[PDB]
Amino acid sequence: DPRLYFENRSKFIQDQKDKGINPYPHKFERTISIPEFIEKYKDLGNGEHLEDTILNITGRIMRVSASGQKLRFFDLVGDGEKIQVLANYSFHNHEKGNFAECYDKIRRGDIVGIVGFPGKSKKGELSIFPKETILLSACLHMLPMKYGLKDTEIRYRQRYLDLLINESSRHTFVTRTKIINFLRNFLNERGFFEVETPMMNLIAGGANARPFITHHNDLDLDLYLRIATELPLKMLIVGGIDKVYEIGKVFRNEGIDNTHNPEFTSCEFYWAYADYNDLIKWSEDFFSQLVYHLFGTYKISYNKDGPENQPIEIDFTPPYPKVSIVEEIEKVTNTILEQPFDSNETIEKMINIIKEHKIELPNPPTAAKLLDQLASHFIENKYNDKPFFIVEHPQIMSPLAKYHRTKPGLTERLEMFICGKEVLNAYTELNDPFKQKECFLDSAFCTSLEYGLPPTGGLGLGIDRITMFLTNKNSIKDVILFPTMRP
Template sequence: MASDSPAGTHKDPVTGEMISKTELKRREKQREKDAKKAEKAAAAPPQAASKPAAANEDDLNPNQYFELRARTIQKLKETQSPNPYPHKFHVSQSIASFVEEYSKEGLISAGQKLDDVIVSLSGRVHNIRSSGNKLKFYDLHGEGTQVQILANVRDAEDSDEFISTQALFRRGDIVGVIGHPSRSQKGELSISPSSMVLLAPNLHQLPSAHFGLKDQETRYRKRYLDLIMSPGTRNIFLTRARVINYLRRYLDNLGFLEVETPMTSMVAGGATARPFVTHHNDLDLDLYLRVAPELYLKQLTVGGLDRVYEIGRVFRNEGIDLTHNPEFTLCEFYMAYADMYDLMEITENLLESMVRYLNGGSTIVKYHPEGKDGKELVMDFKTPWKRYDMIETLEEKTGVKFPPGDTLHTAETNRFLRDLCVKHNVECSEPRTNARLLDKLVGDFIEPLCISPAFITGHPQVMSPLAKNHRSRPGLCERFEGFMCGKEFCNAYTELNDPFEQRLRFEEQSRQKEQGDDEAQGVDEVFVDALEHGLPPTAGWGMGIDRLIMFLTDSPNIKEVLLFPAMKPIETVANTSGKEPGPAGQL
């Protein structure tokens, strides 16, 4: 079978990366040296009984520790005494349930053990303390909770096996415990085991229990290790799950139907964004990863599904920064026989009630943005929220009168906006279209005003190719954007349902695309055909889940709220940081 490896490269058996033959030999020699050092350390005289378990191993570097630990586990696999990777261990209750049940006051006294109760728990060992080889204390962690294991040989069913099993355990191992609920002499809730079993060994040294995992790069690349070491990380993702669950229940209670739409399509539409391109081999066809589910959801509304929503991933081939990731989670819903004003009310009520649910009734959320000298931003989600009219606020902040709304698309207005940006040092890269220039001005003058949640309204039609024209202000459309902490979190409008006007808007977008704006949308004939069958008066809404979670969990970087954020390949990081590269191609 032909190899997929590049010519002249070999696979490192430990890291899995593809490297040169010379580099492979160098690493093998280094590992042999590390293994000899590890064996020498392991053969050293045993430490005093009061020392922690595996004290000598704690002095090894990570490579030495891995080599020694891997050899030990390989020998166990060969002898099966015991099997280090058993198939099953019966767990009678979770650690959280155990702590809740047996921590009740007066149930177990200090130094007491409930001999008539037997439980079996499992979890990961985070700390080991020894008092000789007959008494050891373990901190057992699981599901965000911990309990002490008070392992005394006097409680063991088989004392010899008990001692030999204890000698196998290291920090980070997953173990099973069968024993009795108890309390130590100092009154700490514990489990006193009659037997313990190794369920899955950890071959690597855990970071220090005292200092934890501090390196940000490692936390994002090895989220499993971050979750092991950082309770705060676990809490962020528990909150994320609660937010998504609350959002679903809120929409379901309003009579919305959750649906799923395609991830790939022949036209990248539904949002002004640069798409990813992929290829379908069987059809020999280039496709786009979706930038938004909007056009599909509106087709469903045409089909009679009056209230639909979707929560899922979208993909935008754009920059990565503190608030942007190339793939993110979006919620969009479409509500027939509603307009933008109905959705503003729904947005306010949704988020105020959600924050009260998360914060025990309070509407106040504090946020500490990165790079702001620790400045604290205080948001109040209590309704009603402040509303900023885009053109009126820009006129107020810049001190100039803007052209009439029905001329905001013209070349004259483009010159006006260019001059205004130069005057106020507002940077805008090419192509400097009217929409992009206006967006940059809004970013400098209006968005910073929105600390507590607020709405920006009164968008020009040139910025909103899918929104319905304003019913009383020519040249503007019925659209609002929600902002907090100066960042957008939602976007909504009264939907354009006129197929003739929609085609003209799409064609204008196509002209902008030809002029170099690769974020502009093209003409979607399928969607126009759907509109020709009749879309009822409808309002549509979209919200970025990840950015909302950032604000609700005081996370200054979007990578904190994504389990697996986009990262540069490790080789690229190694070339710029001087660190040894890890597995090839890892993101």
Template sequence: MAGEKNGQAQDINQLLKVRREKLKELQDNGKDPFVITKYDVSHHSQEVKDNFETLEGQTVTLAGRVMSKRVMGKASFCHIQDLQGMIQSYVARDSIGEEEYKAFKKMDIGDIVGLKGEVFRTKTGEISIHAAEVTLLSKSLQILPEKFHGLTNTDIRYRQRYVDLIMNPEVKDTFIKRSQILKEIRKFLDGRGFMEVETPMLVSNAGGAAARPFETHYNALDEDVKLRISLELYLKRLIVGGLERVYEIGRVFRNEGVDTRHNPEFTLMELYQAYTDYEGMMELTESMFRYLAETVCGSAVLSYNDTIIDMSKPFERITMIDAVKKYS
């Protein structure tokens, strides 16, 4: 078993060495890919597919990462992955030129390229780009996880989110949805007269929650301070100061355990409203969740882990004691 692992490590080291040698060869020939800083992109992959009827026969430029490559003598196929997804390209020696085709054959999976060519549909019906130019924009010196098995190692997925984004397309959707949720929370609260604020992160007393804080030192004041564990105390002071509706979306820090569901720094949202009670806050919370489901997910009825969650219905109001009696 140890010998097998050593063999795999040697194979990987050899592959990494080959990639660095390819880079050196490019640099020696005045074709250093790392000096290209700009490439004009006209379309993304999904745009081309969605607008095929109007774009067929038109020249487009895309940029992305080479995710697969099939070389067949004078012509090859490759798949390019960009922000929106994946698209196939047909790369023929007669179309891009002999020297450029030789350069293309030396490209590796993971390399980032600029692609210019005509939009067409192959005999098998796949919307593709007939390449006129393939420009190496950045050389990938690391090796992507083997595609057949994918990236499943939880530790790598959480420590190297960029690799997870490359290999697991559904992860990108989570990032996009998170951004949309924050945008819509702001839109919803702003529509209700709330004002977004920023409050101090370095505090003398890390209150507002029960958690162990990170401690650091403020050199200018020669004073020990803590990173905030909550947003609460300063927001309440703003209410005292006469701002009637405030909210903050900000990082807080808790010097505690780490696992796939707990991080020592995370984003928290808190809001405070004067002249209302807990009934008013329940109504606001329910309305906001329903609004977010409808605007971000397209429907108030959601499916999560094979469970249907219907946010269009009125939320149940229940005391903690009654909830314990009902569900335990």
């Protein structure tokens, strides 16, 4: 029980090897899985056995029970579904070892191949009746019980233990790929095209973050890891790919939070001849149909304050509330910020309302980062009953967004927030090389615009944050398999 269980099971493998019994066989020819076994023999008669249809099935023993040395009860799991094993001495093929020698050797956690027939016990339990039982691979360690996990960080370290004990985690991850599959098929329906852009570049462009640094030995270059796929995707639209998208990982060297991770899955599409309204119409259709594709209703339950407090209802019914960033800030505080924002009359007009409201000052106090913290404390945690948009950002905050059609100083940028956390960022791209801020971003992108970029609108998604709200999870390490951990 302490640590000696790892020793005798290890010697048990050696005792089987010396006696001539190979403990890890090569191939077991199973003819039926467990989920299909459940679907095929679900409505059998209580006590009915199908003796003429023998089946070969595999699985992992999760409960070892006995009753008289000649009747042994097991729990065989596989692909998230569970059936019972009713090993009876009279049904055992008395030609491959003794019954006791064939069943006293296996314990909890062992992968075993079963040769038997389907049937239901008198208690009404669908079970497989093995005439032959062969150990495929033994579990040398002591597996914890049901509620002996999902507490410590052993899940984030050894996820294979968390996937075999808690039905939640398996449901968290089958819904994660269900989202990615729904998102991939959603774009393909609109004629989008999936591509692959490089991840090791000589410049860190696309967003605002802190990059990584690696080195190529055969070339002697110190390359930067990407933070987004903004620049290469636009170059492909110049190449004729009007509808293009890409799903993949992006790297960030920021602080690790419950919504922040060193690496996470990104998704950016770029729609040619699409304006500001085409994006919000695309966003409201995507999130609404997604939660309806999963839960059958636009209203979902989500414990915002951990599993210890009551949840809050998140309504995904379009249209979502649109909010202007500069217009809402100057109303809740009645501090009129006149453009230009990078002046000196207004840059401290908002400094005297961030330290006056007991909020951390962001250094450097640039007009772009001041409006960011002002929006993060006055607009973000506004509508938790339903997601909302923060639209019409200033041009100081979005150096890659096209000028607004009428309103000066602003742009057509939009950010969707769920429970106050950004999960979407979209704007109409700035296809003017002369009205650009950075070309006076690498030259590979500045030269790409000089060849002609159509009026394009882009959008980025946070899939790792989306799965958090769509699975009632509060941490970023719950929605990814192997999060970065400290030894």
